[PDB]
Design an enzyme around this catalytic site. Structure first.
Site, PDB file in Angstrom:
ATOM      1  N   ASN B 184       0.687   2.885  -1.853  1.00 47.52           N
ATOM      2  CA  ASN B 184       0.725   3.808  -0.707  1.00 47.52           C
ATOM      3  C   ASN B 184       0.692   3.106   0.658  1.00 47.52           C
ATOM      4  O   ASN B 184       0.530   3.778   1.674  1.00 47.52           O
ATOM      5  CB  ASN B 184      -0.397   4.831  -0.786  1.00 47.52           C
ATOM      6  N   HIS B 186      -1.595   1.119   1.909  1.00 47.59           N
ATOM      7  CA  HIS B 186      -2.926   0.951   2.489  1.00 47.59           C
ATOM      8  C   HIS B 186      -3.514  -0.381   2.011  1.00 47.59           C
ATOM      9  O   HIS B 186      -3.211  -0.810   0.896  1.00 47.59           O
ATOM     10  CB  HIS B 186      -3.855   2.099   2.066  1.00 47.59           C
ATOM     11  N   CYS B 221      -8.607  -0.621   7.557  1.00 45.87           N
ATOM     12  CA  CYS B 221      -7.873  -1.571   8.374  1.00 45.87           C
ATOM     13  C   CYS B 221      -6.373  -1.299   8.154  1.00 45.87           C
ATOM     14  O   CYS B 221      -5.930  -1.201   7.011  1.00 45.87           O
ATOM     15  CB  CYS B 221      -8.251  -2.999   7.984  1.00 45.87           C
TER      16      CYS B 221
END
Ligand SMILES: CCC(=O)N1CCC[C@@H](NS(C)(=O)=O)C1
Ligand SMILES: CCC(=O)N1CCC[C@@H](NS(C)(=O)=O)C1
Lengths: 265, 262
Positions: B184, B186, B221
């Site tokens: 995804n 991330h 982050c």
């Protein structure tokens, strides 16, 4: 995994893991390159290696990669089993060559293939040297005598000369430093990390709209744990070709040069 | 891997790989943390799950805390069996536990626990889960408590303080690469463990083994963000850790590690 019936090649099946896939829910080229390293390590372990012989350990000699070439037709999806068959072959006094064939465990079709050229080198002085006769005889018994090439074609892309990227580069990724996860059991930067660093300068749009078909990467110098790398890319072209260059962010010392080929999804 | 007889936990065996071991020829704590994520993924897949119903309301399960205690790191080639399971933490969130065992001896060589909270994937707003969703997953959890860390007054539930400047040690300019991202896009929760341990001095790593690691997750982050890793000795060797954005100094993570002499 296990050695084949003749003991001249090794086969191993891998289930693709959740953290090993990219945005397309298929294994990344770095996961594939890790699986090749893993199957190659087990092939050496199955015939008694650690991949140094008794003469190589005596003279402080090691096998290092000079070139890596990987061509993928289909990336295995998360959960799919992939069977990789590897084997070695002597290239005279130049060094050894290791080849791989990736297959689908269900259909049995070739979904990728790889080749690599390894050279002999003194572990301490970093000086490359030709393979001597006494070393060559110790491993020739584990290699097929008749040639067995993953890339046999008359004009294959695994043996072409890679040029040096000229400044300014079209794309770049600056300030890349390796972490402890990028190091191996001997504290050297893993050869797979260089592939990840090479692909960091590929624009995100190219990644989102294309699939990586081929990657040829020449290894010139090893990057230390305390070194910083600069990744440079320039388009050299239905399909997209690129020229790559990894170099030390300071002096500009070349550590790697390569080429990638991408096709539309 | 497969669900146990009662279908209230999942077991899977992993052979330790060559690129997964460190300098001492044993699996790293990041490899272990990856195997826990993998076995947890397959447990959810084995019971049809990412989760259900909360897909239309746009809700996701996010980690709030990770706690891992290792007694023995599996060597290269060794098989390690991990058993995982979930449990409801009332209405604060959910909890996932793990037990790492030796496939040959059958002894517990490590154990982990994690607290998961539920937020809107878009607005990132932390909120408690409804009773309609707190019923769809309870059929896959043991009804009587089953804790990997049951001890009254234990390391997995202690409050972690914020590191004060100046830090004793630091590693700055840490950016994630495409290998650090998941399906995804991330930054996967394991990368934070690697970044936390980047500020641990090399001498400590070469002369000690990581016994415990408690890590609190405050902010995610982004791919285009830069992290600063800070560490201070608070003493065996104990450390206080802090990950923060290179610019503003926005806190993303805080933790503690405990190391034993080899
Ligand atoms: C199965 C191991 C084996 O046959 N060899 C042949 C000689 C080179 C080594 N392999 S290598 C470093 O990958 O080129 C060891
Ligand atoms: C086997 C799967 C399962 O029991 N669950 C329960 C609810 C939380 C999820 N697990 S999670 C994201 O790891 O907390 C899915």
């Amino acid at each position: 995994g296990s050695l084949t019936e003749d003991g001249l090649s090794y086969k191993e099946k891998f289930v693709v893991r959740s953290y090993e896939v990219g945005s397309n829910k298929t294994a990344t080229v770095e996961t594939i390159a890790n699986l090749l390293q893993e199957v190659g390590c087990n092939h050496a372990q199955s015939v008694g290696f650690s991949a140094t012989t008794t003469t190589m350990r005596k003279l402080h000699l090691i096998w290092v990669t000079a070139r890596m070439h990987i061509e993928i037709y289909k990336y295995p999806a998360w959960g799919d089993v992939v069977e990789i068959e590897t084997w070695c072959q002597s290239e005279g006094r130049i060094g050894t060559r290791r080849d791989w064939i990736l297959k689908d465990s269900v259909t049995g079709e070739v979904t990728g293939r790889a080749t690599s050229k390894w050279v002999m080198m003194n572990q301490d002085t970093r000086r490359l040297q030709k393979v001597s006769d006494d070393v060559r005889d110790e491993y020739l018994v584990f290699c097929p005598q008749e040639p067995r090439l993953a890339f046999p074609e008359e004009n294959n892309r695994s043996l072409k000369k890679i040029p040096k990227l000229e400044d300014p580069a079209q794309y770049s990724m600056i300030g890349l430093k390796p972490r402890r996860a990028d190091l191996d059991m001997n504290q050297h930067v893993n050869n797979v990390t260089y592939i990840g660093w090479v692909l960091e300068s590929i624009p995100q749009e190219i990644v989102d709209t294309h699939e990586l078909q081929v990657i040829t990467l020449d290894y010139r110098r090893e990057c230390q744990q305390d070194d910083v790398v600069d990744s440079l890319t320039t388009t050299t072209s239905n399909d997209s070709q690129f020229l790559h260059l990894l170099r030390l962010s300071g002096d500009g010392q070349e550590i790697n040069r390569g080429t990638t080929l991408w096709r539309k999804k």
